[PDB]
Structure formats: structure tokens, C-alpha cells
Amino acid sequence: KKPETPEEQQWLVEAQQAKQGQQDPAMVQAQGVLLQGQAELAKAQNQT
Amino acid sequence: RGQFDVVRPVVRKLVSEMRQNPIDVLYRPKDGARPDAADVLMGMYRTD
């Protein structure tokens, strides 16, 4: 959307870069339920 | 002296229709204007 500064400015730009910073690890972390299946490949190499 | 007065039912029909149409005050801001500029005029119109 980008700031249009209607009555607020400081809280917009601050939390804008902070919300974008949350998105980057979050999408990778969402794969965590499927990381259980990837961990089977890790355990496969570990037992051997 | 006669009357049939079908005149005034048609007038009263139109009178009841224009009172239920909403014409008063709203105010929408102009291009590049803040959205909180409308309630200044509309709010002080409604006070007095």
C-alpha cells in the first residue's frame, strides 16, 4: 500500500520493516511439519 | 362548487418520496486530501 500518512506516520514505517522481517523466517518455519519427513533422511544417514 | 382533488394525492405521493431520499451533508475529501478532513465540516454542521 505504502504510507499515505493520514494521521499516523511513525508507527507505519516502523512496523512496516518489522512485519517484513517476520515473513522471511515464518514461511520457512511453516515447512516444520514436513521437516519431520526430511528428518527421516537425516536419521537414515545417522544410523548408518 | 365542486372538487375531486386528485391533484393533491399526487403531490403528497411525491412529497413523501423526496423526504425519504437522503440529501443533506456528507463531504468527501478531494484528491490528495486526508480522510479526516470531512468530519470537520460535517461535524460542525451537525452541531449548530
Buried (b) or exposed (e) across A1-39, using 16+ Cβ within 10 A? eeeeeeeeeeeeeeeeeeeeeeeeeeeeeeeeeeeeeee
Experimental method: cryo-EM
Q: How many CB pairs under 8 A join A and B?
A: 5
Instruction: Give B34's contacts in chain A (Cβ within 8 Å).
Output: 6-7
Q: Which residue reads 490528495 in cell numbers?
A: B32
CB A8 within 8 A of CB B34: no
Resolution expressed in Å? 10.5
Q: Which residue reads 512485519 in cell numbers?
A: A19
Q: From the CA of A38, how many Å to the nearest CA of chain B? A: 51
A41 CB-side CA count, 13 A: 4
